[PDB]
A paper describes a structure:
Signaling is initiated when the bound GDP is exchanged for GTP on Gα, which results in conformational changes that dissociate the heterotrimeric complex into Gα·GTP and Gβγ.
The x-ray crystal structures of the SmGPA·GTPγS and OsRGA1·GDP complexes were solved at 2.57 Å and 2.99 Å resolution, respectively, by molecular replacement using AtGPA1 as the search model. SmGPA crystallized with two monomers in the asymmetric unit and OsRGA1 crystallized with four monomers in the asymmetric unit. In comparison, the OsRGA1·GDP complex structure highlights how changes in the active site following GTP hydrolysis result in large-scale conformational change. Although the backbone of the P-loop maintains position, multiple side chains from P-loop residues, such as Glu49, Ser50, and Lys52 in OsRGA1, shift. For switch I, the loss of the terminal phosphate breaks the key binding and catalytic interactions. The loss of interactions with the bound ligand shifts the position of the β1b-α7 loop in switch I, which includes Arg191 and Thr194, away from the GTPase domain. Of the four OsRGA1 molecules in the asymmetric unit, three lacked electron density for residues corresponding to α8. Finally, the interaction between residues in switch III and the helical domain is broken, as the latter shifts away from the GTPase domain.
Residue numbers in the entry: 40 to 103, 107 to 129, 134 to 155, 162 to 204, 215 to 220, 237 to 314, 320 to 342, 347 to 375
Write the structure that this text describes.
Amino acid sequence: HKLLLLGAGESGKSTIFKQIKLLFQTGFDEAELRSYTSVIHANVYQTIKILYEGAKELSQVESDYVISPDNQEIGEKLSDIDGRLDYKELVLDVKRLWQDPAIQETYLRPDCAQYFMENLVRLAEAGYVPTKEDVLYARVRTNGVVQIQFSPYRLYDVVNAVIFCAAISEYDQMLFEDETKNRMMETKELFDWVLKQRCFEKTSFILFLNKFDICEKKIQKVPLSVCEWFKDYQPIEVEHAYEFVKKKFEELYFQSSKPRVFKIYRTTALDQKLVKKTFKLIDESMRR
Ligand SMILES: Nc1nc2c(ncn2[C@@H]2O[C@H](COP(=O)(O)OP(=O)(O)O)[C@@H](O)[C@H]2O)c(=O)[nH]1
Ligand SMILES: [Mg+2]
């Protein structure tokens, strides 16, 4: 019955966790969405907060990002909020907070947050219930362990099965935390390190290759050979490049060869019913 979620950075494991929550019951789902609006509101408020803080700092350190002077008085009420406690007047402020191009070139430097910036007025009014997409895009800092038991059987996010989330699209990107390191390389480092440890030998392994939609969008412009792991790559399309990444993920797994159980899944975490399928396939596969 046991499943554990392991990933690196923005692997999407919490998103998998979230939409398994919307998909399965976990009957209430009350107002689950309704309890989650406070969260959603929060990211709206600290997103334009970090956006505002950026523009001024970069303006001080770089020869100009200049804000509109009349905005500062409504602009720093933002800093006056501080999220003291779970927080249409604010949407009129925030839209009228945004208009300077400065803070969007600081933006054009969290991809989910821009969505929220496209849906304020729907969130504004009292008759608001978040869509399923609002829940998925909502960012909740994961504190501790989260247990969910449900039957179509507990899922953990921070054991009979380890779901490893590898965001194949991250091959372009360096680490957000470390500009030197590459996230695909850190995924390989993490994946290898998890495979080597003696505490998950008994555990069955399921691998998710996430953010595939970004992969099909991005592959046609940036070569996959940028990655040192994928430097071997030379095209003839999308399916082959994806299966190429599989090869690497395969051969990497099998080199940890001691004289059991392995599965790989093509996943998009931000859409659901692609994902329902994935769970259907592994829960029927989890025989014995
Ligand atoms: N395009 C796309 N983005 C995703 C998907 N899953 C997650 N994300 C992005 O990843 C971020 C959140 O990842 P998260 O679940 O927190 O990864 P975690 O920190 O390892 O749990 C969000 O900004 C999403 O936009 C996906 O299937 N497709
Ligand atoms: Mg997470």
